[model samples]
Target: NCSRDTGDELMAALLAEGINLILPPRDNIAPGDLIIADPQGGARLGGWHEVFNLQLSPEVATDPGFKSFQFRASSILQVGVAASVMGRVLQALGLGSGSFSSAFSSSNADTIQLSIVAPANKELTNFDAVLVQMNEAKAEPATDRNFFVVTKVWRARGIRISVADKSKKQVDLSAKAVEELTAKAKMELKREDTGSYAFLAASQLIFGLTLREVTYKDGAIVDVPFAFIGDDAFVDLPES
Candidate 1:
């Protein structure tokens, strides 16, 4: 064994100190790798992190050629693209919960902006149904997988409050934070025995990053998905 080196020293120290590193299985794929399973041997596996990593780099920012990628054109949280869903979600949250009534009692509903912060590519477990319904009308030919993504979205009563720019202010996206938000949303959106409609409302109110488009190309396969933040309900419907 080639264990008489610095690596062996560190291993011995770790053992002495009772520090154990839980490593992934040797056969396991790298983190951020997406595996699309097909029982008939048509399965495809790919990593999306690299595509987005380069897409957001300083080089790409200044490159005019990369600008043509529609997802890179502007901020994902387009006020126009997000307004409809935000209004509907707030309206539903407001009407459903009397306690939250005073929050939206103001005249201009549009003025109340919802702020969201989350880790890059956080899986939105809360929006499975919403995405399924949105995709049902058009299945995108052959693309097999898709899901919504969300961060911590905060509801403010007025536009006076400013949400810090992305990567500017750190926000907590811990399990506790998510659990609390979930409880709060449930309280506000869960109505008096409205059943599925109430459940649907809860799902809609979540300001998840909606996948506007997912394209899988041939050769070096890539599933390019444009995750438009803060828009979960509308797909083809938008006023702004």
Candidate 2:
């Protein structure tokens, strides 16, 4: 048979690797995109995280004396750090990401900067929950959909952290990067999405991640998600 293509594949592919510009027609974000920050504790908070959700509010639009389709303005973007070992902890601090490592050790909490990426592949897998779940639910291998790879990445920040439980570790990032975000402050974000037949490099927003250890059952686990309101926009560094 000949090769086949799907429209879902087309849309998923355009999810734009963000963090360089801020305005309408900006990066059309998705959940499987990513977020990066410094390691906070048990796990690494700085690793590129698979976004659970990136909400851009609907803008108000109106037409002139002739049009009816209407025009619009405004947008939104929140780094929903979905289910993961460390993300759960990061959510607790709310305004800051922390670690117990210190002279006395009383939880050194501090606000950290975050960035985003939406590539189709990357150099590494910070948390490949998609592949994990697919393997776990192998009973439906027939439905095996590939959406993770290396070479590209996605990242964003500023909304507010959100959490349901350990199984659902996550948070809404603030709307500003702690670093100097210029019209081209091109920070490091990662994902995979290029080369020939890179569908495997497709990405997902990863709304939730239900990770299971060597054993079954759970305790720590998983939203228009309120914290995401007033989401922020980010742009990359300008060319020299």
Candidate 3:
């Protein structure tokens, strides 16, 4: 069930008026302007992408190959958090059944790995973890417990990047701050219109994030390298 107030209702109304519906597989319409027909009864005006393009009418519809748009999001999830969430989602889909395994035991064994693929002139420096929930056991009826497993894995070049000055005297900023700084740096470098300057500036920021120990987990330092390009040399160092 879902509920909405004036703000949501106004947004929905605007979307229903065909504000920003995009066409599927192409992102040509908005998500709020679409309309969908219930299998049991009448048609309902949904989000932008629904009614604006009749060819792509189904709300929350999966691709022909059964892939959802949500799966393609760019947000990065922690390795462990991702694994746990995926296990629960799979169980809900009836594709698997069992209690998620928290340990590397025979009753709940799992593995994780990472790979990188980039084209020439496009160097992909840091490759992070990808969370996958695999169901090795088949679903069965009358089973009191279904079995699944979760695992966290990290991947990279094993290289660390940091500020040239590391006297522990520098004030560290949050991750969001660093990201904002990087964005601003990119914009300023682009405005300069100097090819070499922009590349160098961006590469520097990338290297800093790559090497600096911005975060710690389980009393261990996590290393990630940052790269920057162009004339953007400002590094938004994180706060401890």
What are the lDDT scores of the predictions, listed in order?
0.26, 0.21, 0.21
State in Å the error of residue 173, model 1: 30
| lDDT (Cα, tens digit) per residue for candidate 1, span 1-240 | 112122333234322322211111012222222333232323233333322332211110111111111111112222232343333443333322332222222212222223222111123232334334333333233234442222112111211112122443422233442343345552232222311111223211222122322333442232343343122112221211
Q: What is the TM-score of each candidate against the true structure?
A: 0.22, 0.16, 0.16
Error of 2 at 127 (Å): 15
Top candidate, metric TM-score: 1
Clash count of each predicted structure: 0, 62, 55
CA lDDT for candidate 2 = 0.21
**Local error of candidate 2 at residue 156 (angstroms):** 17
TM-score of 2: 0.16
Residue 166 accuracy (lDDT) in model 3: 27
Candidate 3's displacement at residue 217, Å, is 45
Error of 3 at 55 (Å): 16
Q: Measured by TM-score, how close is model 1 to the native structure? A: 0.22
lDDT of 3 by residue, 1-240 (tens): 112122343224422322211111111222112223232333222332221222321222211221111111121223243234323322322211122222112112222111111101111122121100001111121111111110111111111111111232212223442343344322221212221111122121111111111122233213322212112121221111
Compose the digit string of candidate 2's lDDT tens values, residues 1-240.
001121222212222221222211113333233222112211111111222221321121222211111112111112222112123322222212221121002212132112122222222223345335423442311101112121122322311212122233232222232221111222222222321011111232211111111111232111000111012121111111
RMSD of 3: 24.7
